[PDB]
Amino acid sequence: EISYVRGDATAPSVKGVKMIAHVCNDLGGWGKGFVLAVSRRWPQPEAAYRAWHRDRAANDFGLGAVQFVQVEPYVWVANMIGQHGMKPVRYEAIGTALGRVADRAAELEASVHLPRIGLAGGTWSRVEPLISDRLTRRGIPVTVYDHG
Ligand code: NA
Ligand code: NA
């Protein structure tokens, strides 16, 4: 059962392996919103993402791909390529990425921690059902965080 909490998703307070999953764009932009909250806590995810994008001519970077970045002994950030362009979230891309998060979280026995991007609007009304279908359906604990 998805938990809804007000908090900073970069600091989950639960036991066991934690995975913080969030939506990135496919253009290499890391400059507004939750990506800044991540860089306020750890430098690794941003460095990883920029390198991943820079080297896309030799690697898996693209819509629906996910990069897992270890930031603490039992904490990982999952940079999901889910958004096409910048100021537009792609349903197939987010679905695929969340499934990949689910695969990795299942093997790590991790819980998953996501910032909220409500169910009455275009974005979250696509995303939350894919959380249910790709994560909850597999028995993976999920917590969704509200913060500015
Ligand atoms: Na919430
Ligand atoms: Na709230």
Residue numbers in the entry: 3 to 89, 96 to 125, 128 to 158
Copy text from the publication.
SCO6735 is a 161-amino acid protein with molecular weight of 17.4 kDa that belongs to an uncharacterized subgroup of macrodomain proteins. Here we determine the structure of SCO6735 and show that this protein hydrolyzes glutamate-linked protein mono-ADP-ribosylation. Furthermore, we show that depletion of SCO6735 leads to a significantly increased production of antibiotic actinorhodin in S. coelicolor.
Surprisingly, in SCO6735 this loop is located far away (∼15 Å) from the binding cleft. Two amino acids from this loop, Gly126 and Cys127, which were not well defined in the electron density maps, are omitted. To check that the position of the phosphate binding loop in our structure is not a consequence of crystal packing, we carefully checked all contacts between amino acids composing the phosphate binding loop and surrounding symmetry equivalent molecules. We found out that there is only one hydrogen bond (Leu129 N-H … Oδ1B Asp156). A structural comparison shows that the catalytic residues of TARG1 (Lys84 and Asp125) are not conserved in SCO6735 and BT1257 (replaced by Gln and Ala, respectively), additionally confirming that these proteins utilize different catalytic mechanism.
